[PDB]
A = this chain, B = another copy of it.
Amino acid sequence: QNRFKKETKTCSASWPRAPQSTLCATDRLELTYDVYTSAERQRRSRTATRLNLVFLHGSGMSKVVWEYYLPRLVAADAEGNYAIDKVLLIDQVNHGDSAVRNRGRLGTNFNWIDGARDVLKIATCELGSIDSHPALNVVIGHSMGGFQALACDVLQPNLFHLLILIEPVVITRKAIGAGRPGLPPDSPQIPENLYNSLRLKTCDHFANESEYVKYMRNGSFFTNAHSQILQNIIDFERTKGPVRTKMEQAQNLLCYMNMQTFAPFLISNVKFVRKRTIHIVGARSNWCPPQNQLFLQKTLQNYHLDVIPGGSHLVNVEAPDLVIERINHHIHEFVLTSPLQSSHIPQLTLEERAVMFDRAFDSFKNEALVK
């Protein structure tokens, strides 16, 4: 990929966090993310909208699943006068390179809302320079990342203009079974059959390189991923003669075991998400129950569904070309209808600012005053 300069950066994770996010209360987690910056900035006119994209991986994956997307994303468009300026590919604290940095620090409580706070900490930093203006920011999330896209807007509704959710996980199936007695209403839970079956597809450690690649291509969740994305997954996860993955099996499993302790907060707040939100689903997906999709449709005021024919829950890695075509379509249409868009850095004195404010205030007072 030769379109964007790549830099890997590391910073501290958001703090504070849910109890038992770390092993010890004095531990502090870090985040590692890759920033991709356009090398096309000398082709931008003054009036050109900068598009910034932030991609949030699914449970048990990493930022690497989006690398295939980078050269295939929305070309700079002449008259619509926009271009991609930055793309951020983020690993949650217990995934990918962030997990490696956080070895020995992670606890049992991974709260996806804490992870949305991490996203905000990164993106508000990276997208916040007076340079990034006039900007339009887009968050694209798969699975957990889709939940987190929504939670980002809830917690900071002035950052993302467009949400693209690919198979978001919001409403899960409630376990029926028996089942620990005396628990508070919203206690962490997972059905045994789901745990066992996830355990068999989340292996972490292997005798050698041959057994590692054999498992990745035959026994992991990624066997049907686009061959280039699978190869990228294989190469990114490998750590070292036995082989261990960056993704820890326990951390992978914990992504499934704690939903009740944070999903109600998100569910209760989807009604505040006023942004255009694209919901991309795989037609063959039964990963989430019907109520998951229908809740989003009923609750998001500005909502569009795209169904990927043949797609599974992992449609982002198994049919990336179809997913990319949608993401490009929606970003293009969104920019075309987006309000202008002032791009001059104001050269105003304090006195000019005073006259302008007083005028703004008079206008606002006239609109607010109930006579």
> Per a CB cutoff under 8 Å, which of B23, B189, B353 touches A356?
B23
A9–B148 Cα distance when bound, in Å, is 33
A338–B368 Cα distance when bound, in Å, is 46
Q: Are B20 and A371 in contact (CB under 8 A)?
A: no
Which residue among A133, A258, A342, A360 has the maximum number of chain B CB atoms within 10 Å of its CB? A360
Q: Are B15 and A128 in contact (CB under 8 A)?
A: yes
> Per a CB cutoff under 8 Å, which of B195, B271, B346, B348 touches A369?
B195
Q: Are A16 and B368 in contact (CB under 8 A)?
A: no
- In A90-146, the 8 Å CB interface with B consists of 103-108, 114, 117, 124, 128, 130, 133-134
The yes or no answer to A177 lying at the interface (CB within 8 A) is: yes
A211–B107 Cα distance when bound, in Å, is 62
Residues on B with beta carbons closer than 8 Å to the beta carbon of A105:
353
Q: Are B364 and A257 in contact (CB under 8 A)?
A: yes
Residues on B with beta carbons closer than 8 Å to the beta carbon of A180:
367-368, 370
> Per a CB cutoff under 8 Å, which of B177, B271, B370 touches A370?
B177
- Among A30-38, A155-163, A229-237, A315-323, the stretch in contact with B: A155-163
Q: Are B192 and A371 in contact (CB under 8 A)?
A: yes
The yes or no answer to A39 lying at the interface (CB within 8 A) is: no
Q: A103-B350, A364-B188, A364-B257 are in contact. Are A357 and B250 (CB under 8 A)?
A: yes
Q: Are A371 and B128 in contact (CB under 8 A)?
A: no
Q: A15-B128, A104-B354 are in contact. Are A188 and B370 (CB under 8 A)?
A: no
The yes or no answer to A28 lying at the interface (CB within 8 A) is: yes
> Per a CB cutoff under 8 Å, which of B188, B268, B346, B370 touches A24?
B346
Scan A231-250; emit 1 where CB is below 8 A from any B CB, else 0.
00000000000000000001
Q: A128-B15, A177-B370 are in contact. Are A106 and B357 (CB under 8 A)?
A: yes
Q: Are A175 and B370 in contact (CB under 8 A)?
A: yes
Q: Are A346 and B26 in contact (CB under 8 A)?
A: yes
Chain B, Cβ-Cβ closest to A177: B370
A117–B14 Cα distance when bound, in Å, is 13
Size of the chain A interface, CB-CB below 8 angstroms: 73
Q: Are A265 and B272 in contact (CB under 8 A)?
A: yes
Which residue among A134, A368, A370 has the maximum number of chain B CB atoms within 10 Å of its CB? A368
Q: A124-B15, A191-B370, A265-B272 are in contact. Are A353 and B23 (CB under 8 A)?
A: yes
Scan A332-358; emit 1 where CB is below 8 A from any B CB, else 0.
000000000010011010100110111
Give A contacts to B, CB under 8 Å. Answer: 14-20, 23-28, 103-108, 114, 117, 124, 128, 130, 133-134, 155-156, 158-159, 175-180, 187-192, 195, 250, 253-254, 257-258, 265, 268-269, 271-272, 342, 345-346, 348, 350, 353-354, 356-358, 360-361, 363-365, 367-371
Sample 19 A-B pairs with CB under 8 A, ordered by A number.
Answer: A14-B124, A15-B124, A16-B124, A23-B353, A23-B360, A24-B346, A26-B345, A26-B346, A104-B348, A104-B354, A107-B357, A108-B360, A155-B155, A178-B370, A187-B368, A190-B370, A191-B370, A257-B368, A268-B271
